[PDB]
Amino acid sequence: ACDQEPIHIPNAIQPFGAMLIVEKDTQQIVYASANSAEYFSVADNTIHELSDIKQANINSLLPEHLISGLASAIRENEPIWVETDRLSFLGWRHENYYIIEVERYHVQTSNWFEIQFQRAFQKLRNCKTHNDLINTLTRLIQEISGYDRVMIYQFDPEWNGRVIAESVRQLFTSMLNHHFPASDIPAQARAMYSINPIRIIPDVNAEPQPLHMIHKPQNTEAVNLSSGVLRAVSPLHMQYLRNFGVSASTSIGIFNEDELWGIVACHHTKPRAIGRRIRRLLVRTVEFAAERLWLIHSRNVERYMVTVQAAREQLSTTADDKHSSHEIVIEHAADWCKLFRCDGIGYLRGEELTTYGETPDQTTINKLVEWLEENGKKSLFWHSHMLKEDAPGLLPDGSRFAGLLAIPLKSDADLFSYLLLFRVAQNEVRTWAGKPEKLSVETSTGTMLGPRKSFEAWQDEVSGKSQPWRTAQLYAARDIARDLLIVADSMQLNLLNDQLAD
Amino acid sequence: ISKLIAACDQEPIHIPNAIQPFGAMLIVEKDTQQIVYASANSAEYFSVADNTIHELSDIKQANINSLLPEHLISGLASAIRENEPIWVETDRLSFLGWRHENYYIIEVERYHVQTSNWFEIQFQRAFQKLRNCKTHNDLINTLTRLIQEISGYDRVMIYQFDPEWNGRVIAESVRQLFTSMLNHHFPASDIPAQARAMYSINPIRIIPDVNAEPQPLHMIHKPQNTEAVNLSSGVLRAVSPLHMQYLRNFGVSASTSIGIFNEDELWGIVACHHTKPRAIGRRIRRLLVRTVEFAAERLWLIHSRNVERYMVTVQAAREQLSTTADDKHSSHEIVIEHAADWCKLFRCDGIGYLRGEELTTYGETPDQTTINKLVEWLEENGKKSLFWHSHMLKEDAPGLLPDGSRFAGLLAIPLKLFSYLLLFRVAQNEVRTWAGKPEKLSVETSTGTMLGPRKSFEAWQDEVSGKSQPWRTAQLYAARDIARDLLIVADSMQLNLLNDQLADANENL
Numbered sequence A: 001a002c003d004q005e006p007i008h009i010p011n012a013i014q015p016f017g018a019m020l021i022v023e024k025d026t027q028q029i030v031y032a033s034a035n036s037a038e039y040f041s042v043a044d045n046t047i048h049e050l051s052d053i054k055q056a057n058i059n060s061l062l063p064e065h066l067i068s069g070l071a072s073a074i075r076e077n078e079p080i081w082v083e084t085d086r087l088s089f090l091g092w093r094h095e096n097y098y099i100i101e102v103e104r105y106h107v108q109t110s111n112w113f114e115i116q117f118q119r120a121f122q123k124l125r126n127c128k129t130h131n132d133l134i135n136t137l138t139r140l141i142q143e144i145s146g147y148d149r150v151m152i153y154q155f156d157p158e159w160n161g162r163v164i165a166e167s168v169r170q171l172f173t174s175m176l177n178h179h180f181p182a183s184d185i186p187a188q189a190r191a192m193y194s195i196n197p198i199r200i201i202p203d204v205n206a207e208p209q210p211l212h213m214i215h216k217p218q219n220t221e222a223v224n225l226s227s228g229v230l231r232a233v234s235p236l237h238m239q240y241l242r243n244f245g246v247s248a249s250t251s252i253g254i255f256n257e258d259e260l261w262g263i264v265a266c267h268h269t270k271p272r273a274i275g276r277r278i279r280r281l282l283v284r285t286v287e288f289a290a291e292r293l294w295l296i297h298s299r300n301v302e303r304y305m306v307t308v309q310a311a312r313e314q315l316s317t318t319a320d321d322k323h324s325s326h327e328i329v330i331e332h333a334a335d336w337c338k339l340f341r342c343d344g345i346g347y348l349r350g351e352e353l354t355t356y357g358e359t360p361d362q363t364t365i366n367k368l369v370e371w372l373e374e375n376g377k378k379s380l381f382w383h384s385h386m387l388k389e390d391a392p393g394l395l396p397d398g399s400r401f402a403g404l405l406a407i408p409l410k411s412d413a414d415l416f417s418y419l420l421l422f423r424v425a426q427n428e429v430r431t432w433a434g435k436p437e438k439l440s441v442e443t444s445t446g447t448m449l450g451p452r453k454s455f456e457a458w459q460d461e462v463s464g465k466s467q468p469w470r471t472a473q474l475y476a477a478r479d480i481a482r483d484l485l486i487v488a489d490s491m492q493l494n495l496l497n498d499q500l501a502d
Numbered sequence B: 001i002s003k004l005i006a007a008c009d010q011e012p013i014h015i016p017n018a019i020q021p022f023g024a025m026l027i028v029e030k031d032t033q034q035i036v037y038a039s040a041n042s043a044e045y046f047s048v049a050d051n052t053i054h055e056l057s058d059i060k061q062a063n064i065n066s067l068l069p070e071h072l073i074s075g076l077a078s079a080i081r082e083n084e085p086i087w088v089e090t091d092r093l094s095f096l097g098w099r100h101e102n103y104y105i106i107e108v109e110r111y112h113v114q115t116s117n118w119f120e121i122q123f124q125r126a127f128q129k130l131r132n133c134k135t136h137n138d139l140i141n142t143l144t145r146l147i148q149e150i151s152g153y154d155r156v157m158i159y160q161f162d163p164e165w166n167g168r169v170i171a172e173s174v175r176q177l178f179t180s181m182l183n184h185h186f187p188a189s190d191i192p193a194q195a196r197a198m199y200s201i202n203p204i205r206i207i208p209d210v211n212a213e214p215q216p217l218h219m220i221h222k223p224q225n226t227e228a229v230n231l232s233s234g235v236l237r238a239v240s241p242l243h244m245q246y247l248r249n250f251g252v253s254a255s256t257s258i259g260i261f262n263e264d265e266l267w268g269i270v271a272c273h274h275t276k277p278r279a280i281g282r283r284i285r286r287l288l289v290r291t292v293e294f295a296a297e298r299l300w301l302i303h304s305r306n307v308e309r310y311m312v313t314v315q316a317a318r319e320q321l322s323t324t325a326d327d328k329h330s331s332h333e334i335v336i337e338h339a340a341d342w343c344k345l346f347r348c349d350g351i352g353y354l355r356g357e358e359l360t361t362y363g364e365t366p367d368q369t370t371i372n373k374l375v376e377w378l379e380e381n382g383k384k385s386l387f388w389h390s391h392m393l394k395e396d397a398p399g400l401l402p403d404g405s406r407f408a409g410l411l412a413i414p415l416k417l418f419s420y421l422l423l424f425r426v427a428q429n430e431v432r433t434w435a436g437k438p439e440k441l442s443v444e445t446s447t448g449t450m451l452g453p454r455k456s457f458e459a460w461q462d463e464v465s466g467k468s469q470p471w472r473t474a475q476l477y478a479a480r481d482i483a484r485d486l487l488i489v490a491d492s493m494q495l496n497l498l499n500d501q502l503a504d505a506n507e508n509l
Ligand SMILES: *C/C=C1/C(=C/c2[nH]c(/C=C3[NH+]=C(/C=C4\NC(=O)C(C=C)=C4C)C(C)=C\3CCC(=O)O)c(CCC(=O)O)c2C)NC(=O)[C@H]1C
Pocket: A001, A002, A003, A005, A007, A151, A153, A161, A163, A175, A180, A183, A184, A185, A186, A189, A199, A201, A232, A233, A234, A236, A237, A240, A249, A250, A251, A263, A265, A266, A439, A449, A450, A451, A452
């Protein structure tokens, strides 16, 4: 019921600007935030109270270019940004309505943004690794935004997440490598980043301004405020931020194409106001950082394939030196352990077994081979990172092996042949920002589904599991294993030809 | 002619001791703080900065601290890394200064105050459009459309280099005034190596007026070192007269180009032309370079993901092969079942699988006799390799193929009683349109005698025959893996047959 709160239609705004909601076909103003008088009086003396906006003509409150744009815009939820000498308007269409946000603005011209943008592009282009990219991005967001704690928060497949990079200044504890549960950001909150990539909360304790009905709309249903920035903040998130020790907040979605991959999360210990040009500078910067990061990852994929091609050219050369596949394994199995990020290797053909590194004993290898022969066929390869779950009754009790990659090399033939790659359990200590308790009621606040009070480090453990096998490794190990098969088959064809000759 | 082209790289374009006239330039010594050079138009710019300036002679007496704003002086002093320009604006002047060895170089332009949200809206629209480009063709065409809309230049082109630094226009947005150059080939000599190198020092080059008289540098106070000062980091550096005449012959009054970098290698340039003079301010310059930079990372990401998608396709094929083989099909049956797919996967016209005396072919292949001449010849010369490949057999393997053979491409995977997978590519003769006939001009310059610019850029065709598309690396390894998949099935069946004949032999014995 965390994802059931209708945060798109709160009928209230944060007080760092005002909002109007107009009907498209009637041009009537049907809603105005309660603070609207103090914004539009900057342009018009006559406006002293909310009811003066009810007497007002939409053509007298809005710039002609805002109205023109809105009239001609084809796309819904595509905000038009229009400035006067004193006000910065952000308007867009949603169904029968124009939604218009307004903030206070004044012209002050410099080359600061262009200089910051050039430096950000230069630093990001010189990142060659994932680590360098992410830490550079946090430093840049912190320079540009002035917030005291800037984090990169990456989602896992369950929408749990982790802080993986961080620039944190002072007054703030370090959240780096802390885990957060999925409840901290419910699905409709994640969804908002696809509508507007930035979310700004200049002041956690600013009181929200409700939307008042001005002229009677044709349809009474709440209006979706999703594309702007003024949308009021769910009280559960406000309190979560208060518990986090946060007074202002800003997050930017990190998108891998359409996929929400992670988030730049920025916190400040005091209220802090950053304008439209800073918000856009931040979003442009995150967009360039994300492209570059996906490019680093994609290039690492090619680079790995080059590494595997090198290992196979090394293997073909040992084989040209007339060595048996048994001898190839003893020669190269340690390089393979790096290539495959595994702890041990068994190569099996018929009665013959060759091992390297951390391996179950020969008995257990034979029981795995038999089990795979009976229950693991019908697969190019069989893998597991939770071996006791996935193939019980096999390992001895208390065994430390948790991962297995198995490449079958024969089928319906005279003997069995496998390449086996083993991973020991890695018993990972996860640090959580407070115990990830499933929500019920928080008795300190008397809140149904309330957030945890404390984000202080809390450690748990998941055992009996290894790294999952990457797709790139599955195929590279199948390729390596089948290189051995070709060697062994060549030698068995020689031997068999001789014996049939006799 | 080779010598005349090589002499193009001789002109030291980094030290012309002159500037384009859309600004002014001062050069100061770092240790002595004295002004050692001033472009000849300095006084019309710095008279805005000091009322006592009325003439170039007045710079000789002037103190630097009254000519440059405090932020620029502090910034240049505190500047550690060379060739990193500092951009400082005043009310009326836009300054740009950097340090090069023992000099500060300062360019100054006239400045028009921008008070709108235009640039930020353009940045948002450009990035939105580039982020939504998911193919190579979409990216490059969207890029030229954005560069033309932002800059207003009448012709924008993406010009990609080949490994020999010739190039081709691969995308274009051109307005009614100019002739289309799409798919036209230009030779390397159009952009000498020194010229290609300048993009690494400043990614943008700006020539607002091809007929603007360049302003020489005047010595103010004597420098310790009389060598000409390197001007490469700025934008005011005067243009080679050979390239100005080139642009005149191209019918161009103004140009701006932005280098396209893939990491540290110059992969091409965005070239923009106008039929009248056209200056672009510092902000438009930055918006251009930032857009080209976001677009390139996008393009490299698109290519890199294409390799990933190609490997997914290859693995889906190899899984299909495995499904067929587990129905106890022979290798020749598998080749007949899947070779039409393999021809797409490998973009080839034909495939042959050879195993001892057996040959299976699909699509266009040489005849059996030629296939045996290939196989036998490969054993002599392809023993040292994992695969062997050529996209011009008649050069890479002279005398091998019969006279008149349609075939130009060969990818051969050895499997052993010989066994091979052979992948064949028909010659696809390729007509190239060049921008102008190759004229062998000679021109006597100051730096020596070198190639003069072409006078005509009209379409001139030539033709490359006897070649196929070149084999991509992803295809070499994919084909090798398919081939060895076929080897493994064939070996399995020979092993089965051998064990049967052996068990029968021992039974009869
Ligand atoms: C039962 C509902 C719950 C809930 C709701 C909720 N949360 C948000 C918004 C955000 N939550 C965030 C969480 C984090 N901030 C961090 O800094 C980190 C990690 C370092 C995490 C995990 C963030 C970032 C947001 C976005 C807003 C922001 O930037 O602060 C919403 C949406 C708020 C709104 O826009 O109205 C909602 C409804 N959170 C829970 O914990 C439970 C109780």
